[PDB]
Coordinates of C-alpha atoms and ligand atoms in Angstrom, one line a residue:
Chain D
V7 CA 0.0 0.0 0.0
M8 CA 3.1 2.3 0.3
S9 CA 4.2 1.6 -3.3
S10 CA 3.7 5.4 -3.8
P11 CA 2.9 8.3 -1.4
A12 CA -0.6 9.0 -2.9
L13 CA -1.7 5.4 -3.0
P14 CA -3.1 5.0 0.6
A15 CA -5.4 8.1 0.0
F16 CA -6.5 6.7 -3.3
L17 CA -7.3 3.3 -1.9
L18 CA -9.2 4.9 1.0
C19 CA -11.4 7.1 -1.2
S20 CA -11.9 4.4 -3.8
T21 CA -13.0 1.8 -1.4
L22 CA -15.4 4.2 0.3
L23 CA -16.9 4.9 -3.1
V24 CA -17.3 1.2 -3.8
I25 CA -19.0 0.8 -0.4
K26 CA -21.2 3.8 -1.3
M27 CA -22.3 2.0 -4.5
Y28 CA -23.1 -1.1 -2.4
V29 CA -25.3 1.2 -0.3
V30 CA -27.2 2.3 -3.4
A31 CA -27.7 -1.4 -4.2
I32 CA -29.1 -2.0 -0.7
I33 CA -31.4 1.0 -0.9
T34 CA -32.6 -0.1 -4.3
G35 CA -33.6 -3.5 -3.0
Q36 CA -35.4 -2.0 0.0
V37 CA -37.3 0.4 -2.3
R38 CA -38.4 -2.6 -4.5
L39 CA -39.7 -4.4 -1.4
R40 CA -41.4 -1.4 0.1
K41 CA -43.0 -0.2 -3.2
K42 CA -43.7 -3.9 -4.3
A43 CA -42.0 -3.2 -7.6
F44 CA -40.0 -6.2 -8.9
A45 CA -38.2 -6.6 -12.2
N46 CA -38.9 -10.3 -12.6
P47 CA -42.1 -12.4 -12.4
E48 CA -40.4 -15.0 -10.2
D49 CA -39.7 -12.2 -7.6
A50 CA -43.2 -10.8 -7.8
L51 CA -44.9 -14.1 -7.3
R52 CA -42.9 -14.6 -4.1
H53 CA -43.9 -11.1 -2.8
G54 CA -47.6 -11.0 -3.4
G55 CA -48.5 -11.7 -7.0
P56 CA -47.9 -11.1 -10.7
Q57 CA -49.2 -7.5 -10.5
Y58 CA -46.0 -6.6 -8.6
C59 CA -43.8 -7.2 -11.6
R60 CA -43.9 -3.5 -12.5
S61 CA -41.8 -0.4 -12.7
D62 CA -41.8 2.3 -10.0
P63 CA -40.4 5.8 -10.3
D64 CA -38.4 5.5 -7.1
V65 CA -36.9 2.2 -8.2
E66 CA -36.0 3.8 -11.5
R67 CA -34.4 6.7 -9.8
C68 CA -32.2 4.3 -7.7
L69 CA -31.2 2.5 -10.8
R70 CA -30.2 5.9 -12.5
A71 CA -28.1 6.8 -9.5
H72 CA -26.3 3.4 -9.6
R73 CA -25.8 3.7 -13.4
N74 CA -24.4 7.2 -13.1
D75 CA -22.0 5.8 -10.4
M76 CA -20.9 3.1 -12.9
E77 CA -20.3 5.8 -15.5
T78 CA -18.1 7.9 -13.2
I79 CA -16.7 5.9 -10.3
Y80 CA -15.4 3.0 -12.4
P81 CA -13.3 5.2 -14.6
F82 CA -12.0 6.9 -11.4
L83 CA -10.9 3.5 -10.1
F84 CA -8.7 3.1 -13.1
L85 CA -7.5 6.7 -13.5
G86 CA -6.7 7.3 -9.8
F87 CA -4.8 4.0 -9.5
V88 CA -2.6 4.8 -12.4
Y89 CA -2.3 8.5 -11.4
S90 CA -1.1 7.4 -7.9
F91 CA 2.0 5.9 -9.5
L92 CA 2.9 8.9 -11.6
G93 CA 4.6 10.8 -8.8
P94 CA 2.1 13.6 -8.3
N95 CA 2.5 16.1 -5.5
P96 CA 0.9 14.2 -2.6
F97 CA -1.3 17.1 -1.4
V98 CA -2.4 17.8 -5.0
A99 CA -3.3 14.1 -5.4
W100 CA -5.3 14.2 -2.1
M101 CA -7.2 17.2 -3.4
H102 CA -8.1 15.3 -6.6
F103 CA -9.3 12.3 -4.6
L104 CA -11.2 14.3 -2.0
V105 CA -13.0 16.4 -4.6
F106 CA -14.1 13.3 -6.3
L107 CA -15.2 11.6 -3.1
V108 CA -17.1 14.6 -1.8
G109 CA -18.7 15.3 -5.2
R110 CA -19.8 11.7 -5.7
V111 CA -21.3 11.3 -2.2
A112 CA -23.1 14.6 -2.7
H113 CA -24.3 13.4 -6.1
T114 CA -26.0 10.4 -4.6
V115 CA -27.6 12.5 -1.8
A116 CA -28.8 14.9 -4.4
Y117 CA -30.1 12.2 -6.7
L118 CA -31.8 9.9 -4.2
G119 CA -32.9 13.0 -2.1
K120 CA -34.6 14.6 -5.1
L121 CA -32.8 17.9 -4.5
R122 CA -33.6 20.8 -6.8
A123 CA -31.8 21.3 -10.0
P124 CA -29.0 22.1 -10.6
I125 CA -27.6 20.6 -7.4
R126 CA -27.0 17.1 -8.8
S127 CA -25.6 18.5 -12.0
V128 CA -23.1 20.7 -10.2
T129 CA -21.9 17.8 -8.0
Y130 CA -21.5 15.7 -11.2
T131 CA -19.4 18.4 -12.9
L132 CA -17.4 19.0 -9.7
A133 CA -16.4 15.4 -9.4
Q134 CA -15.6 15.1 -13.1
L135 CA -12.9 17.8 -13.0
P136 CA -10.3 15.8 -11.1
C137 CA -11.0 12.9 -13.4
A138 CA -10.4 15.0 -16.5
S139 CA -7.2 16.3 -14.8
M140 CA -5.9 12.8 -14.0
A141 CA -6.8 11.6 -17.5
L142 CA -4.8 14.3 -19.2
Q143 CA -1.8 13.8 -16.9
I144 CA -1.8 10.1 -17.7
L145 CA -2.1 10.8 -21.4
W146 CA 1.1 13.0 -21.3
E147 CA 3.0 10.5 -19.2
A148 CA 2.0 7.6 -21.4
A149 CA 2.7 9.4 -24.7
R150 CA 6.1 10.6 -23.6
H151 CA 7.1 7.0 -22.8
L152 CA 6.2 5.5 -26.1
Chain U
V7 CA 1.8 -13.0 -11.9
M8 CA 3.7 -14.2 -8.8
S9 CA 4.0 -10.6 -7.4
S10 CA 1.9 -12.0 -4.4
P11 CA 0.8 -15.6 -3.5
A12 CA -2.9 -14.9 -4.0
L13 CA -2.5 -13.1 -7.3
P14 CA -2.7 -16.2 -9.6
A15 CA -6.0 -17.3 -8.0
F16 CA -7.4 -13.8 -8.3
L17 CA -6.4 -13.5 -12.0
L18 CA -7.9 -16.9 -12.8
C19 CA -11.3 -16.2 -11.1
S20 CA -11.4 -12.6 -12.5
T21 CA -10.7 -13.6 -16.0
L22 CA -13.2 -16.5 -15.9
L23 CA -15.8 -13.9 -14.7
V24 CA -15.0 -11.5 -17.5
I25 CA -15.4 -14.4 -20.0
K26 CA -18.7 -15.2 -18.3
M27 CA -19.9 -11.7 -18.9
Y28 CA -18.9 -12.0 -22.6
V29 CA -21.0 -15.2 -22.6
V30 CA -24.0 -13.1 -21.4
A31 CA -23.3 -10.7 -24.2
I32 CA -23.3 -13.5 -26.8
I33 CA -26.5 -15.0 -25.4
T34 CA -28.2 -11.5 -25.5
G35 CA -27.4 -11.2 -29.2
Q36 CA -28.7 -14.6 -29.9
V37 CA -31.9 -13.9 -28.1
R38 CA -32.4 -10.7 -30.0
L39 CA -32.0 -12.6 -33.3
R40 CA -34.2 -15.5 -32.3
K41 CA -37.0 -13.3 -30.8
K42 CA -36.5 -10.6 -33.5
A43 CA -36.2 -7.9 -30.9
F44 CA -33.7 -5.2 -31.8
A45 CA -32.9 -1.9 -30.0
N46 CA -32.2 0.1 -33.1
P47 CA -34.2 0.8 -36.3
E48 CA -31.1 0.2 -38.5
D49 CA -30.8 -3.3 -37.0
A50 CA -34.5 -4.1 -37.4
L51 CA -34.6 -3.1 -41.0
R52 CA -31.7 -5.5 -41.8
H53 CA -33.5 -8.4 -40.0
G54 CA -37.1 -8.2 -41.4
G55 CA -38.6 -4.7 -40.9
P56 CA -39.3 -1.8 -38.7
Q57 CA -41.7 -3.8 -36.5
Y58 CA -38.8 -5.7 -35.1
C59 CA -37.4 -2.6 -33.3
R60 CA -39.1 -3.6 -30.1
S61 CA -38.6 -4.8 -26.6
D62 CA -38.8 -8.4 -25.5
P63 CA -38.9 -9.8 -22.0
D64 CA -36.1 -12.3 -22.6
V65 CA -33.9 -9.7 -24.0
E66 CA -34.7 -7.4 -21.1
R67 CA -33.8 -10.3 -18.7
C68 CA -30.4 -10.8 -20.4
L69 CA -29.7 -7.1 -20.1
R70 CA -30.6 -7.2 -16.4
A71 CA -28.2 -10.0 -15.8
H72 CA -25.5 -8.2 -17.6
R73 CA -26.2 -5.0 -15.6
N74 CA -26.1 -6.9 -12.3
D75 CA -22.8 -8.4 -13.4
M76 CA -21.4 -4.8 -14.0
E77 CA -22.7 -3.7 -10.6
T78 CA -20.9 -6.6 -8.8
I79 CA -18.0 -8.1 -10.9
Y80 CA -16.4 -4.8 -11.8
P81 CA -16.0 -3.8 -8.1
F82 CA -14.6 -7.3 -7.5
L83 CA -12.0 -6.7 -10.2
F84 CA -10.8 -3.7 -8.3
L85 CA -11.1 -5.0 -4.7
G86 CA -9.7 -8.4 -5.4
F87 CA -6.7 -7.0 -7.2
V88 CA -5.8 -4.7 -4.3
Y89 CA -6.6 -7.4 -1.7
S90 CA -4.2 -9.8 -3.4
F91 CA -1.3 -7.4 -2.6
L92 CA -2.2 -7.0 1.1
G93 CA -0.6 -10.2 2.3
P94 CA -3.8 -12.2 3.0
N95 CA -3.5 -15.8 4.1
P96 CA -3.5 -17.5 0.7
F97 CA -6.2 -20.1 1.6
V98 CA -8.5 -17.4 3.0
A99 CA -7.9 -15.4 -0.2
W100 CA -8.8 -18.5 -2.3
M101 CA -12.0 -18.9 -0.4
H102 CA -13.0 -15.2 -1.0
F103 CA -12.3 -15.6 -4.7
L104 CA -14.0 -19.0 -5.0
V105 CA -17.1 -17.9 -3.2
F106 CA -17.4 -14.9 -5.5
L107 CA -16.8 -17.0 -8.6
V108 CA -19.3 -19.7 -7.7
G109 CA -21.9 -17.2 -6.4
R110 CA -21.7 -15.2 -9.6
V111 CA -21.9 -18.1 -12.0
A112 CA -24.8 -19.4 -10.0
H113 CA -26.4 -15.9 -10.2
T114 CA -26.3 -15.9 -14.0
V115 CA -27.7 -19.4 -14.2
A116 CA -30.5 -18.5 -11.7
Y117 CA -31.3 -15.3 -13.6
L118 CA -31.2 -16.5 -17.2
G119 CA -32.7 -19.8 -16.1
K120 CA -35.7 -18.1 -14.4
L121 CA -35.1 -20.1 -11.3
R122 CA -37.6 -19.6 -8.4
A123 CA -37.1 -16.9 -5.8
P124 CA -35.1 -16.5 -3.7
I125 CA -32.4 -18.5 -5.5
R126 CA -31.0 -15.6 -7.4
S127 CA -31.1 -13.3 -4.4
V128 CA -29.3 -15.8 -2.2
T129 CA -26.5 -16.2 -4.9
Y130 CA -26.2 -12.4 -5.1
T131 CA -25.9 -12.1 -1.3
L132 CA -23.4 -15.0 -1.1
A133 CA -21.1 -13.4 -3.6
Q134 CA -21.3 -10.0 -2.0
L135 CA -20.0 -11.3 1.3
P136 CA -16.4 -11.7 0.2
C137 CA -16.5 -8.4 -1.5
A138 CA -17.7 -6.7 1.7
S139 CA -14.9 -8.5 3.5
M140 CA -12.2 -7.4 1.1
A141 CA -13.5 -3.8 1.0
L142 CA -13.2 -3.5 4.8
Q143 CA -9.7 -5.1 4.8
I144 CA -8.6 -2.6 2.2
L145 CA -10.1 0.3 4.2
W146 CA -8.1 -0.6 7.3
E147 CA -4.9 -1.1 5.4
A148 CA -5.3 2.2 3.5
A149 CA -6.3 4.2 6.6
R150 CA -3.4 2.9 8.7
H151 CA -0.9 4.0 6.0
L152 CA -2.2 7.6 5.7
Chain R
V7 CA 4.9 3.8 -16.6
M8 CA 7.9 1.8 -17.9
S9 CA 7.3 -1.1 -15.6
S10 CA 6.8 -3.2 -18.8
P11 CA 7.4 -2.4 -22.5
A12 CA 3.7 -2.6 -23.5
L13 CA 2.4 -0.5 -20.6
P14 CA 2.8 3.0 -22.1
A15 CA 0.8 1.9 -25.2
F16 CA -1.9 0.4 -23.0
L17 CA -2.2 3.5 -20.9
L18 CA -2.4 5.7 -23.9
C19 CA -5.2 3.7 -25.5
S20 CA -7.1 3.2 -22.2
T21 CA -7.0 6.8 -21.3
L22 CA -8.2 7.8 -24.8
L23 CA -11.1 5.4 -24.4
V24 CA -12.0 6.8 -21.0
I25 CA -12.0 10.2 -22.5
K26 CA -14.2 8.9 -25.4
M27 CA -16.7 7.7 -22.8
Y28 CA -16.7 11.1 -21.2
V29 CA -17.4 12.5 -24.7
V30 CA -20.5 10.2 -24.9
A31 CA -21.6 11.6 -21.5
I32 CA -21.2 15.2 -22.7
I33 CA -23.1 14.4 -26.0
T34 CA -25.9 12.7 -24.0
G35 CA -26.4 15.8 -21.8
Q36 CA -26.4 18.1 -24.9
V37 CA -29.1 15.9 -26.6
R38 CA -31.2 16.0 -23.4
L39 CA -31.1 19.8 -23.4
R40 CA -31.7 20.2 -27.2
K41 CA -34.6 17.6 -27.3
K42 CA -35.9 18.7 -23.9
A43 CA -35.9 15.1 -22.6
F44 CA -35.0 14.8 -19.0
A45 CA -35.0 11.7 -16.8
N46 CA -36.0 13.5 -13.6
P47 CA -38.9 15.8 -12.7
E48 CA -36.6 18.2 -10.9
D49 CA -34.6 18.6 -14.1
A50 CA -37.7 19.1 -16.3
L51 CA -39.1 21.8 -14.0
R52 CA -35.9 23.8 -14.4
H53 CA -35.9 23.5 -18.2
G54 CA -39.5 24.3 -19.1
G55 CA -42.1 22.2 -17.3
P56 CA -43.1 18.7 -16.2
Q57 CA -43.9 17.7 -19.7
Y58 CA -40.2 17.5 -20.5
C59 CA -39.6 14.6 -18.1
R60 CA -39.9 12.2 -20.9
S61 CA -38.0 9.7 -23.0
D62 CA -36.5 10.5 -26.4
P63 CA -35.1 8.1 -28.9
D64 CA -31.8 10.0 -29.4
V65 CA -31.2 10.2 -25.7
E66 CA -32.0 6.4 -25.5
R67 CA -29.5 5.8 -28.3
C68 CA -26.8 7.8 -26.4
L69 CA -27.5 5.7 -23.3
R70 CA -27.2 2.5 -25.3
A71 CA -23.8 3.6 -26.7
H72 CA -22.6 4.5 -23.2
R73 CA -23.9 1.1 -21.8
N74 CA -22.1 -0.8 -24.6
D75 CA -18.9 1.1 -23.8
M76 CA -19.3 0.0 -20.1
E77 CA -19.8 -3.6 -21.2
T78 CA -16.6 -3.6 -23.3
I79 CA -14.2 -0.9 -22.4
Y80 CA -14.3 -1.6 -18.6
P81 CA -13.2 -5.2 -19.1
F82 CA -10.4 -4.0 -21.5
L83 CA -9.1 -1.7 -18.7
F84 CA -8.7 -4.8 -16.5
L85 CA -7.5 -7.3 -19.2
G86 CA -5.1 -4.9 -20.9
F87 CA -3.5 -3.8 -17.7
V88 CA -2.8 -7.4 -16.6
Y89 CA -1.7 -8.4 -20.1
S90 CA 0.8 -5.6 -20.2
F91 CA 2.7 -7.3 -17.4
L92 CA 2.8 -10.8 -19.0
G93 CA 5.7 -10.1 -21.2
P94 CA 3.9 -10.1 -24.5
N95 CA 5.8 -9.2 -27.7
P96 CA 5.5 -5.4 -27.7
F97 CA 4.4 -5.1 -31.4
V98 CA 1.7 -7.8 -30.9
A99 CA 0.5 -6.0 -27.7
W100 CA 0.3 -2.7 -29.7
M101 CA -1.8 -4.5 -32.3
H102 CA -4.2 -5.7 -29.6
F103 CA -4.5 -2.3 -28.1
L104 CA -4.8 -0.4 -31.5
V105 CA -7.5 -2.8 -32.8
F106 CA -9.5 -2.3 -29.6
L107 CA -9.1 1.5 -29.8
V108 CA -10.0 1.8 -33.4
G109 CA -12.9 -0.7 -33.2
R110 CA -14.4 1.1 -30.2
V111 CA -14.1 4.6 -31.6
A112 CA -15.7 3.3 -34.8
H113 CA -18.4 1.6 -32.7
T114 CA -19.4 5.0 -31.2
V115 CA -19.4 6.7 -34.5
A116 CA -21.5 3.9 -36.0
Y117 CA -23.9 4.0 -33.1
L118 CA -24.4 7.7 -32.6
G119 CA -24.2 8.3 -36.4
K120 CA -26.9 5.7 -37.0
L121 CA -24.8 4.0 -39.7
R122 CA -26.4 1.1 -41.5
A123 CA -26.2 -2.4 -40.2
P124 CA -24.0 -4.4 -39.8
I125 CA -21.4 -1.6 -39.5
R126 CA -21.8 -1.2 -35.7
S127 CA -21.9 -5.0 -35.1
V128 CA -18.7 -5.5 -37.1
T129 CA -16.9 -2.9 -35.1
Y130 CA -18.1 -4.5 -31.9
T131 CA -16.9 -7.9 -33.0
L132 CA -13.5 -6.5 -34.2
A133 CA -12.8 -4.9 -30.9
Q134 CA -13.8 -8.0 -28.9
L135 CA -11.2 -10.2 -30.6
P136 CA -8.2 -8.7 -28.9
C137 CA -10.1 -8.8 -25.6
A138 CA -10.8 -12.5 -26.1
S139 CA -7.2 -13.1 -27.0
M140 CA -5.9 -11.3 -23.9
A141 CA -8.4 -13.1 -21.6
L142 CA -7.2 -16.5 -22.8
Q143 CA -3.5 -15.5 -22.4
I144 CA -4.2 -14.3 -18.8
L145 CA -6.1 -17.5 -18.1
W146 CA -3.1 -19.7 -19.1
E147 CA -0.6 -17.6 -17.2
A148 CA -2.7 -17.5 -14.1
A149 CA -3.5 -21.2 -14.2
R150 CA 0.1 -22.2 -14.7
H151 CA 1.2 -20.2 -11.6
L152 CA -1.3 -21.8 -9.3
Ligands
LIG201 C1 -25.0 6.8 0.0 C2 -26.5 6.8 0.3 C3 -27.1 8.2 0.4 C4 -28.6 8.1 0.6 C5 -29.2 9.5 0.6 C6 -30.7 9.4 0.8 C7 -31.3 10.8 0.8 C8 -32.8 10.7 1.2 O1 -33.2 12.0 1.5 C9 -34.7 11.9 1.6 O2 -35.2 11.7 0.3 C10 -36.6 11.9 0.2 C11 -36.9 12.0 -1.3 O3 -36.3 10.8 -1.8 C12 -37.2 13.1 0.9 O4 -38.6 12.9 1.0 C13 -36.7 13.1 2.3 O5 -37.2 14.2 3.0 C14 -35.2 13.2 2.2 O6 -34.6 13.4 3.5
LIG202 C1 -11.6 20.0 -18.4 C2 -10.8 19.6 -17.1 C3 -9.4 20.2 -17.2 C4 -8.5 19.5 -16.2 C5 -7.1 20.2 -16.2 O1 -6.1 19.4 -15.8 C6 -4.8 19.9 -15.9 O2 -4.3 19.9 -17.2 C7 -3.0 20.4 -17.4 C8 -2.6 20.6 -18.8 O3 -2.7 19.4 -19.5 C9 -2.0 19.5 -16.7 O4 -0.7 20.1 -16.8 C10 -2.4 19.4 -15.2 O5 -1.5 18.5 -14.5 C11 -3.9 19.0 -15.0 O6 -4.2 19.1 -13.7
LIG203 C1 -22.9 -18.2 -18.2 C2 -24.1 -18.5 -18.9 C3 -25.1 -19.3 -18.1 C4 -26.3 -19.6 -19.0 C5 -27.4 -20.3 -18.2 C6 -28.6 -20.5 -19.1 C7 -29.7 -21.2 -18.3 C8 -30.8 -21.6 -19.2 O1 -31.6 -22.5 -18.5 C9 -32.8 -22.7 -19.3 O2 -33.6 -21.5 -19.1 C10 -35.0 -21.6 -19.6 C11 -35.7 -20.3 -19.1 O3 -34.8 -19.3 -19.6 C12 -35.7 -22.8 -19.3 O4 -36.9 -22.9 -20.0 C13 -34.8 -24.0 -19.5 O5 -35.5 -25.2 -19.2 C14 -33.6 -23.9 -18.7 O6 -32.8 -25.1 -18.8
LIG204 C1 -21.2 -7.5 5.8 C2 -20.0 -8.3 5.4 C3 -19.0 -8.5 6.5 C4 -17.6 -8.9 6.0 C5 -16.7 -9.2 7.2 O1 -15.3 -9.1 6.8 C6 -14.3 -9.1 7.9 O2 -14.3 -7.9 8.7 C7 -13.4 -8.0 9.8 C8 -13.6 -6.8 10.7 O3 -13.4 -5.5 9.9 C9 -12.0 -8.0 9.2 O4 -11.1 -8.1 10.3 C10 -11.9 -9.3 8.4 O5 -10.6 -9.4 7.8 C11 -13.0 -9.3 7.3 O6 -12.9 -10.6 6.7
LIG205 C1 -16.7 10.0 -29.7 C2 -17.9 10.7 -30.2 C3 -18.2 10.3 -31.6 C4 -19.4 11.1 -32.0 C5 -19.9 10.7 -33.4 C6 -21.1 11.5 -33.8 C7 -21.6 11.0 -35.2 C8 -22.7 11.9 -35.6 O1 -22.9 11.7 -37.0 C9 -24.1 12.4 -37.4 O2 -25.2 11.6 -36.9 C10 -26.5 12.0 -37.4 C11 -27.4 10.9 -37.0 O3 -27.2 10.8 -35.6 C12 -26.6 12.2 -38.9 O4 -27.8 12.9 -39.2 C13 -25.4 13.1 -39.3 O5 -25.4 13.3 -40.7 C14 -24.2 12.4 -38.9 O6 -23.0 13.1 -39.5
LIG206 C1 -12.4 -16.0 -30.0 C2 -11.2 -15.1 -30.0 C3 -9.9 -16.0 -30.1 C4 -8.7 -15.2 -29.6 C5 -7.4 -16.1 -29.8 O1 -6.4 -15.7 -28.9 C6 -5.2 -16.5 -29.0 O2 -5.4 -17.8 -28.3 C7 -4.3 -18.7 -28.4 C8 -4.7 -20.0 -27.9 O3 -5.2 -20.0 -26.5 C9 -3.2 -18.0 -27.6 O4 -2.0 -18.9 -27.6 C10 -2.8 -16.7 -28.1 O5 -1.8 -16.0 -27.4 C11 -4.1 -15.8 -28.2 O6 -3.7 -14.7 -29.0
LIG207 N1 -25.8 9.2 -18.7 C1 -25.9 10.6 -18.2 C2 -24.8 11.4 -18.9 C3 -24.6 12.9 -18.4 C4 -24.5 12.9 -16.9 O1 -23.9 12.1 -16.2 N2 -25.2 13.9 -16.3 C5 -25.3 14.1 -14.9 C6 -25.5 15.5 -14.5 S1 -27.1 16.2 -15.1 C7 -26.3 13.2 -14.2 O2 -26.4 13.3 -12.9 N3 -27.1 12.5 -14.9 C8 -28.2 11.7 -14.4 C9 -28.2 10.3 -14.8 O3 -27.2 9.8 -15.4 O4 -29.2 9.6 -14.6 C10 -27.3 11.2 -18.4 O5 -28.2 10.5 -19.0 O6 -27.6 12.3 -17.9
LIG208 N1 -29.7 -3.1 -9.2 C1 -30.2 -4.1 -8.3 C2 -29.7 -3.8 -6.9 C3 -30.0 -5.0 -5.9 C4 -29.5 -6.3 -6.4 O1 -28.4 -6.4 -7.0 N2 -30.3 -7.3 -6.2 C5 -30.0 -8.7 -6.6 C6 -30.6 -9.7 -5.7 S1 -32.4 -9.6 -5.7 C7 -30.4 -9.0 -8.0 O2 -30.1 -10.1 -8.5 N3 -31.1 -8.0 -8.7 C8 -31.5 -8.2 -10.0 C9 -31.1 -7.1 -11.0 O3 -30.2 -6.3 -10.7 O4 -31.7 -7.1 -12.1 C10 -31.7 -4.3 -8.4 O5 -32.4 -3.5 -9.1 O6 -32.2 -5.4 -7.9
LIG209 N1 -25.9 -5.7 -24.5 C1 -25.7 -6.0 -25.9 C2 -24.9 -7.3 -26.0 C3 -24.4 -7.7 -27.4 C4 -23.7 -6.5 -28.1 O1 -22.9 -5.9 -27.4 N2 -23.9 -6.3 -29.4 C5 -23.3 -5.2 -30.1 C6 -23.2 -5.6 -31.6 S1 -24.8 -5.8 -32.3 C7 -23.9 -3.9 -29.9 O2 -23.4 -2.9 -30.5 N3 -25.1 -3.8 -29.2 C8 -25.8 -2.6 -29.0 C9 -26.1 -2.2 -27.6 O3 -25.5 -2.8 -26.7 O4 -27.0 -1.3 -27.5 C10 -26.9 -5.9 -26.7 O5 -28.0 -5.7 -26.1 O6 -26.8 -5.9 -28.0

């Protein structure tokens, strides 16, 4: 874990974000049960009848949050890992990771909490900035070692 | 591949799971062709007419299985890789990886096979346990190296 | 970045593909705004009224492209990273990475550009070939080190 100075901070933030995705999965399942809105007939038949194989807007919202997480957190897992080994200034690296972590936690709160626009969109954009920064830094390092 | 004692087992299980996702992709395409249920008008027009740009419940089921795989296997790819370098007891590490592998293969069989509830849900939960375990172990290691 | 001879090429292609996914995300948002097709009521109310919380076929197409990217590029990020450390012939490794990069960029152009079938399907298949190749190579290396 001490293979580079930024790596522990990266691994902490990454793992917290993976756990935060698992929390979204748990919430999704709870909403399905409470709203009786299942995706599969076999599930519905166990939980009250075929009429409960149906869509629900709160379930759909949970799925959108989880999807957006997969669109953003998964690339961070890759970029941040690589970036950690490029010898960034450790404080600058911490700032990239913390901005991503806080932005993404805020995004889920804004999404699942139905907060007014543009709160969710701002949190998304915030969190994408350090990702864009890391991606460009990796591109320069990779290109210059070809 | 021998950078740590758990790494070969991790790479074997991971790669098998990636291949298993590719199998879901292949099945999905076959179901679209057999049910004549395409997502895009350009595809439908090549395969019999515009009426075949339509949804189908078996195609939707395949997509749900693939989505659930992306929600669970992708985090395992990250967590298990990191975990392999944390000096776990090799047998304990094997058990984490094997439980995930067997649970996830069983999940796809249960999902695509339309097995009765709660078989799929149990397989999901089974497989998530080693992921939760690895995530917490990474969190402690990362935190203690800050 | 010089931990193995193939690694710089891998990191270049990977990072370009992550950026290409971000481009799909940007396009998606622009299409939502231009078509006034938002997924959430809070978004619609900010952009003209509740009637604009609605689906749109161009938005749906963008989401399909992004989903297909997550189904294919994310596994490449894992496989290609591992493969880079297995001592492949560097030119052969470059060819795997370049075929994936070109195939995936072509896939997005074909998808978002609504190009006739089977252009998108061919690009998908093209790009999957080096992934299948890397996966099998990893499987043999992992298995033989058990
Ligand atoms: C990582 C998980 C974060 C979960 C954040 C959940 C935020 C829930 O927030 C709640 O949302 C409801 C609308 O959904 C409102 O009616 C409640 O008043 C609000 O507090
Ligand atoms: C859009 C997001 C912009 C992110 C800016 O990112 C910056 O780019 C600079 C120029 O390439 C690099 O020198 C910096 O290291 C990087 O932080
Ligand atoms: C990794 C890929 C696993 C594929 C598992 C496919 C399981 C198919 O299982 C089949 O499903 C049908 C319902 O779909 C049933 O009608 C068949 O009897 C059943 O055998
Ligand atoms: C919910 C899933 C629980 C997974 C338990 O995981 C365990 O947590 C312990 C305490 O943090 C650690 O000491 C162990 O190494 C880990 O296996
Ligand atoms: C990485 C991002 C690639 C973006 C490729 C966008 C291709 C857009 O291509 C455009 O698509 C339209 C149909 O959608 C056609 O009407 C236009 O004539 C065509 O040029
Ligand atoms: C289906 C896609 C096939 C990809 C072929 O991949 C090849 O497989 C060989 C045999 O395992 C390996 O020896 C090669 O290194 C690998 O390139
Ligand atoms: N797939 C996204 C791409 C753009 C994006 O990620 N937008 C942010 C800021 S508006 C978001 O939170 N989107 C909501 C979502 O993905 O459901 C979308 O459909 O909106
Ligand atoms: N996205 C999931 C989150 C919870 C989850 O993964 N549940 C498991 C056990 S019931 C599952 O197999 N879900 C089916 C699915 O994701 O389609 C869902 O909508 O259910
Ligand atoms: N999830 C895919 C699995 C198969 C696949 O990836 N097919 C390629 C070639 S036809 C594709 O471009 N699919 C379009 C898509 O995923 O929307 C699907 O539903 O088609």
